[PDB]
Amino acid sequence: TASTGFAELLKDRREQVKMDHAALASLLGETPETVAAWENGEGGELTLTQLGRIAHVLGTSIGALTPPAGNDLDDGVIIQMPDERPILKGVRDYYVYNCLVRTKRAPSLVPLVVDVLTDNPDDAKFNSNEFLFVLEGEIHMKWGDKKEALLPTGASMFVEEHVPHAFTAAKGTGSAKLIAVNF
Amino acid sequence: TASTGFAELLKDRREQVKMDHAALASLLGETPETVAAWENGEGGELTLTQLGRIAHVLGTSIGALTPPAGNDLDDGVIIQMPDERPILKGVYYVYNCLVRTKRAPSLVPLVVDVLTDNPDDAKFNSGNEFLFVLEGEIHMKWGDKEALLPTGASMFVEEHVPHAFTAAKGTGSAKLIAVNF
Amino acid sequence: TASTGFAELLKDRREQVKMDHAALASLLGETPETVAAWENGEGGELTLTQLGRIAHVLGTSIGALTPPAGNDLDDGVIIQMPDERPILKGVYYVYNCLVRTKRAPSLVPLVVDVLTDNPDDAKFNSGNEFLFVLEGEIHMKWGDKEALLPTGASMFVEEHVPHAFTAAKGTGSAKLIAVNF
Amino acid sequence: TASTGFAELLKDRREQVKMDHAALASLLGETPETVAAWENGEGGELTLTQLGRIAHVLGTSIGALTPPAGNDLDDGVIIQMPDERPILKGVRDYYVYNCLVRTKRAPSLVPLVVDVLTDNPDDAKFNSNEFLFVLEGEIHMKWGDKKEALLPTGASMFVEEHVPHAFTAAKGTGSAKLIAVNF
């Protein structure tokens, strides 16, 4: 939880720097009562700005004083039925992003089924780790300076971070689909 | 800046999970305009609880949406003169805090004044820690082991290890330089 | 290069711990010339045991003294055509390995052919793993829990979690795309 | 241990990539017997070059197939008496490095007592995280483009990684000493 995580992390950092409620309260310009309260799990109303100041006085970051994402698994597993997929369209029309399962235990995991609706290579716009798999059709991949390659169904690829790239269905083939797993 | 840093990282994350303003807004019970306000540096009054909810909806943590500690160095250096040391009591023990930096938050160095020379009254307490015997003779205890450490002796203590120091029996007091990192 | 990488990192570490050739040599029972040979790219014949001793004397690990996996990317990209997939048997299970890279060693993706449609004969096995039901209906088990997953369903399984799949009872077989990272 | 660590890490990576002794042996051009042996703790004689090839085939690094530094603590502690300090002189004469305690459980920890024998600032040569404390005398610190500051006994400082810097005793004071803790 947020307030409880903050309460346990605040106390930890406080002592880590040899301060007692009195000492931190003084640097902060608050009462030992207040600091004691926060550490009792009563800081949920503290604002971003107030938190930044606390983080500054303790010489660390807000992230260091806040709990991790949390657990949303059921005995280590999380499942998503195709009916629950949130959808985002890249209108210009061009791409449809069908978001697959995600988890707070691995925040960087952003998997998707990307429908590639355009089959005009020249109409590809560079975006800028990721694993991909051609689900259906033929994909025309372009990367680097805004190289390319034509990939058949079943081909897989890895694109390193910061690598600008664009996807389009093979010219004339109409459309294509791919699984993109960002991680 | 906290508010500034959040605006940028919030935009990055929301975009990362393929969420438009409306979607995020819908899940939070807010307006798409309010989200755009946040991503514009106007999230300063957001409460810890709210940030947590925003983080939860974006499947990540508050730390992921907040900026790093910051930079308080002068071309890579930060210096502390002996007069600036904050002094904290261990009422027993006196902690004279040495230089610290937001670029290495875990660095907590100190000159510890060890005021008691009676091991029998030693009290155990307590990441990694490096120690150096600055003055006197230190009686050290740990485990649940002991050792007499003369001036100039150095030691390393791993995280979670209970230990205690006192000046050698009848020596009055001693000083340690402790570097927690 | 392994030999090249080692030469450089060996020099860096030895210097880091304030050791001259002679000192290192003394502790290893070698000559100062032999060490200079190593730091010159001539450590190719050193045995695993020896590297470990060198590492030990330098108070670090063999990994600290050896180069990273390397770079097999083409301007950040690596591609695998369906014909290049190595195929491995799970004799039951067929593992068609997809693209891998030395720049992300933990990435082990596959298309798994699930050949049995009898949950009773399911066998449990097994970092993080993302899965997608490519074809058919998958019967999944884990914990010590079950679930019927239709085509297009996606799942995430955390490290150390025992689980097993089989095609739905009487469906013959199914296919999964599994991404271990 | 090295051979045993390698045996447990090799097997781990092997299976991690779905291979059996036969499969890896084939890619490697060796017998399942040999690979089985290595995994039985019999690979201590493998050379650096041979290891690199194994690491290459398994698509990872030698470090990923080798055990961590190891444990050299006594119930979490390691002590060094001033008599055991290894010494290195920076002759040009100029500096004496009295190495303090080190540990395989924190390899980056390199503490030292540095005797600054020169008191001619102009004779300071830039070296290029670290915490420092002036033990004795006055130190003249220079950093950045090959800024400066005069630090009295008891002052402490933090120097970030890659920051080129040079130390010298205050001009005319003769010599000085400092504790330098690299980490």
UniProtKB/Swiss-Prot annotation, chains A, D:
Changing E130A: Abolishes (S)-2-hydroxypropylphosphonic acid epoxidase activity. Its cofactor is Fe(2+). Binds 1 Fe(2+) ion per subunit. It catalyses: (S)-2-hydroxypropylphosphonate + H2O2 = (1R,2S)-epoxypropylphosphonate + 2 H2O. One of its GO terms (cellular component) is cytosol. Pfam families: Cupin_2, HTH_3. Fe cation binds at E130, H165. Its EC number is 1.11.1.23. Keywords: Antibiotic biosynthesis, Dioxygenase, DNA-binding, Iron, Metal-binding, NAD, Oxidoreductase. Changing K18A: Abolishes (S)-2-hydroxypropylphosphonic acid epoxidase activity. GO terms for molecular function: dioxygenase activity; DNA binding; DNA-binding transcription factor activity; ferrous iron binding; oxidoreductase activity, acting on paired donors, with oxidation of a pair of donors resulting in the reduction of molecular oxygen to two molecules of water. Residues 21-40 bind DNA. Changing Y97F: Abolishes (S)-2-hydroxypropylphosphonic acid epoxidase activity. Pathway: Antibiotic biosynthesis; fosfomycin biosynthesis. Residues 128-181 form the Cupin type-2 domain. Residues 10-65 form the HTH cro/C1-type domain. Phosphinothricin tripeptide (PTT) herbicide and fosfomycin antibiotic biosynthesis pathways share early steps starting with phosphoenolpyruvate before the pathways diverge after formation of 2-hydroxyethylphosphonate (HEP). HppE is involved in fosfomycin biosynthesis after divergence of the 2 pathways. Non-heme-dependent dioxygenase that catalyzes the oxidative epoxidation of (S)-2-hydroxypropylphosphonate into (1R,2S)-epoxypropylphosphonate, the final step in the biosynthesis of fosfomycin antibiotic. Homotetramer. This is (S)-2-hydroxypropylphosphonic acid epoxidase. It comes from Streptomyces wedmorensis. The lineage of its organism: Bacteria, Bacillati, Actinomycetota, Actinomycetes, Kitasatosporales.
UniProtKB/Swiss-Prot annotation, chains B, C:
This is (S)-2-hydroxypropylphosphonic acid epoxidase. Fe cation binds at E129, H163. The keyword Iron applies. The gene is hppE. Binds 1 Fe(2+) ion per subunit. InterPro entries: Bact_TransReg_Diox, Cro/C1-type_HTH, Cupin_2, Lambda_DNA-bd_dom_sf, RmlC-like_jellyroll, RmlC_Cupin_sf. It comes from Streptomyces wedmorensis. Non-heme-dependent dioxygenase that catalyzes the oxidative epoxidation of (S)-2-hydroxypropylphosphonate into (1R,2S)-epoxypropylphosphonate, the final step in the biosynthesis of fosfomycin antibiotic. One of its GO terms (cellular component) is cytosol. SUPFAM superfamilies: lambda repressor-like DNA-binding domains (SSF47413), RmlC-like cupins (SSF51182).
